Design a protein around this ligand. Structure first.
Ligand SMILES: CC(=O)N[C@@H]1[C@@H](O)[C@H](O)[C@@H](CO)O[C@H]1O
Ligand SMILES: [Ca+2]
Lengths: 133, 131, 133
């Protein structure tokens, strides 16, 4: 319409995540309005309103991720866990959030850090504006 | 006005899975008012230019990789491995499309889409921001 | 201007019946979602997206069900039958064209209805208007 805010970014880094680390999705497929930062992996709200956030992550073992929301200090909205013994999986999560300007949203690793990002088994993080405030 | 929007949800209603390394046809429509998804070719074609969301959820009881294609280029791949029990393979992406661009899903050598009773396969796409 | 958008999660759900109640509201713009019943009520007629990511450890089959004039309209299902006692996330979603008063909810298979209950991880139900009709 007018306020066109949408991002989709894949992860291509094969370096193991540590607990509490921000999960970076370094390769942008889409980033309209450039409110997503591929250097950190965080989205930062410019225009207040309703957003939908979603991810799909490939993994070869146990994976838990925290969906984080906040300004300079972030709080976890939810934790998604999907386990896999010795087998490849793709898991997913989504969330509708009403965000204020300055609020950031990003995914954060736990203990459970088995996540792949590569050709043939991607991991992706997306979000878009539903309705402006 | 209906023709200034774009939305579909199609499903795969058949017990036989796709052929290896082929485009995945969804033959049944839940909604497709603009006809942007074509059940005879298996392809979405862009009528209204702008930003789209595409997402799918595919049931399988053997190995399955789903590839999403845009105008001949593979955008994303997601794979799920299982043996005789049922899981859902999911994937999705936002894309800014021009009129006439085609979007579709395909499989590779891991092609199973045979869900147990009560587990189906769906592919959705909708226009968020027109230009 | 029409905004209807919700996300709800499970934490202290009333149990009973095959309707999956997500008792904890994260977002409820226009308050379309009823957290005591697990039912979304359409106020603005139009095309809506609905999706769920639900955690199980055993067997689970879920369906997004709707109703018009109180008549139930069954739809597609989605299952995880890994049945090994480890976190698996079953997911599904669809566009639904709704009329005013139409209700939308998640229902489980009475024979396959294990939904994780606890604080390690979350199950989510979300929905939003795509465009009014
Ligand atoms: C368990 C239940 O359904 N009731 C809760 C109630 O405790 C809470 O005060 C209210 C506020 O949103 O949300 C309801 O869902
Ligand atoms: Ca799993």
């Amino acid at each position: 319409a007018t306020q066109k805010i949408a991002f989709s970014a894949t992860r291509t880094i094969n370096v193991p995540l540590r607990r509490d680390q921000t999960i970076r999705f370094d390769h942008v497929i889409t980033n309209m309005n450039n409110n997503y930062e591929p250097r950190s992996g965080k989205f930062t709200c410019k225009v207040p309103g309703l957003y939908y956030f979603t991810y799909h992550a490939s993994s070869r073992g146990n994976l838990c991720v925290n969906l984080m929301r906040g300004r300079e200090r972030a709080q976890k909205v939810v934790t998604f866990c999907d386990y896999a013994y010795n087998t490849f999986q793709v898991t997913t999560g989504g969330m509708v959030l009403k965000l204020e300007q300055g609020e950031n949203v990003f995914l954060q690793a736990t203990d459970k850090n088995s996540l792949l990002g590569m050709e043939g088994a991607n991991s992706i993080f997306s979000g878009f504006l539903l309705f402006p405030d | 006005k209906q023709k200034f929007q774009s939305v579909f949800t199609v499903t795969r209603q058949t017990h036989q899975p796709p052929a290896p390394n082929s485009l995945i046809r969804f033959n049944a429509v839940l909604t497709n008012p603009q006809g942007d998804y074509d059940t005879s070719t298996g392809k979405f074609t862009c009528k209204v230019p702008g930003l789209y969301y595409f997402v799918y959820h595919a049931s399988h009881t053997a190995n399955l990789c789903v590839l999403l294609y845009r105008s001949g280029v593979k955008v994303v791949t997601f794979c799920g491995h299982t043996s005789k029990t049922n899981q859902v393979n999911s994937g999705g992406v936002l894309l800014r499309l021009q009129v006439g661009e085609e979007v579709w899903l395909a499989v590779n050598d891991y092609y199973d889409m045979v869900g147990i009773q009560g587990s189906d396969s769906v592919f959705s796409g909708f226009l968020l921001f027109p230009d | 201007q029409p905004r209807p958008a919700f996300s709800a999660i499970r934490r202290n759900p009333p149990m009973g019946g095959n309707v999956v109640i997500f008792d904890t509201v994260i977002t409820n713009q226009e308050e379309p979602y009823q957290n005591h019943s697990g039912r979304f009520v359409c106020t603005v007629p139009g095309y809506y997206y609905f999706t769920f990511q639900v955690l199980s450890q055993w067997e689970i089959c879920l369906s997004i069900v709707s109703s018009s004039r109180g008549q139930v309209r069954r739809s597609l299902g989605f299952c995880d039958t890994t049945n090994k006692g480890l976190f698996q996330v079953v997911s599904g979603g669809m566009v639904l064209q709704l009329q005013q008063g139409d209700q939308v909810w998640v229902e489980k298979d009475p024979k396959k209805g294990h939904i994780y209950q606890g604080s390690e991880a979350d199950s989510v139900f979300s929905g939003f208007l795509i465009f009014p009709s």
